[PDB]
């Protein structure tokens with residue numbers, strides 16, 4: 001039995017510092033993955049409408065609660081609002097489908113998945129005659145206002161953002177009539193993209209950071225052979241070998257020691273367990289400084305041609 005350390009949010013709620021990622025977790029395999037995770041002691045599950053497996057995640061959670069392996073109050077479930085649903089009636093609807101699929105009566109955190117709004121419709125990635133993203137009318141500011149109502153009604157404990165630059169967070173924080181603040185900013189983070197300035201900014205505002213693709217997302221479709229590879233990095237493995245841990249475990253522990261929440265994905269039971277056995281060792285300061293020095297500003301998660309739309313986040317330095 002394992003328990004991830006808690007990171008305290010500005011709402012005083014306690015967010016487990018390690019969680020289970022579920023993107024690319026196939027139907028069939030994801031339900032068992034969630035169950036294994038829960039038995040191992042995971043309490044934080046990272047989900048999303050756009051991952052299209054929330055119902056199987058729902059099945060697993062429901063079955064675990066019923067068989068009394070875990071209570072709802074101790075689970076920490078996060079999901080996200082996809083950019084094609086920023087318009088107010090759509091925000092409520094998408095949230096309702098997410099909540100239904102997950103068989104929950106409330107979410108612990110509901111995130112804006114990406115800052116840029118997309119054209120509404122029966123289409124997740126609307127594009128033009130080329131492959132250019134088509135933007136929508138409603139902005140993340142519009143969306144947030146609708147999301148704030150979910151909090152007012154007790155349907156969501158807290159709100160957050162994902163893939164936001166500090167400029168975009170500045171925009172949200174200075175928004176007139178702001179009712180709720182983001183408790184986290186979920187962004188790609190790993191030794192090739194250390195996010196030093198964005199983490200500094202977020203923490204200075206009482207906003208935690210959730211590190212996604214911490215293993216370099218080797219199963220991302222668009223991966224290309226020349227693309228860097230964290231898990232195969234010999235310097236990483238070298239440090240791993242020293243602590244009698246795997247490369248993955250070092251890549252997870254890295255975030256823990258920056259007080260950054262981290263959500264590695266796996267559907268392999270052995271790996272799921274391995275990924276949470278990271279509270280029995282420490283990386284030295286020298287090791288941390290070394291790992292930080294690997295920064296290459298390389299984004300594994302940057303495949304969509306969307307730099308023309310107004311709220312594209314990665315043009316900003318941070």
Ligand SMILES: NC(=O)c1ccc[n+]([C@@H]2O[C@H](COP(=O)([O-])OP(=O)(O)OC[C@H]3O[C@@H](n4cnc5c(N)ncnc54)[C@H](OP(=O)(O)O)[C@@H]3O)[C@@H](O)[C@H]2O)c1
Nearest residue numbers: 021022023212213214215216217219248264265266267268
């Ligand atoms: N925009 C966003 O908000 C956003 C974007 C990307 C990701 N995320 C979230 O963050 C999660 C993690 O990111 P990601 O899924 O891109 O990638 P990731 O966690 O960096 O890497 C997942 C890959 O690593 C493998 N793996 C897992 N544990 C391992 C271990 N101990 N040793 C070796 N290989 C291991 C997995 O294999 P198996 O499954 O075959 O074991 C899988 O192929 C996502 O699932 C999602 O929840 C959010």
Ligand SMILES: O=C(O)Cc1nn(Cc2nc3cc(C(F)(F)F)ccc3s2)c(=O)c2ccccc12
Nearest residue numbers: 023050114115116301302303304306311312313
């Ligand atoms: O979404 C995940 O969790 C993983 C994720 N990432 N990406 C890369 C993306 N790049 C974006 C850029 C914008 C932008 F805001 F920049 F316009 C908006 C939306 C996206 S999706 C995908 O293309 C994708 C496809 C299916 C399922 C998940 C994903």
Ligand code: NA
Nearest residue numbers: 190191214251
């Ligand atoms: Na990492």
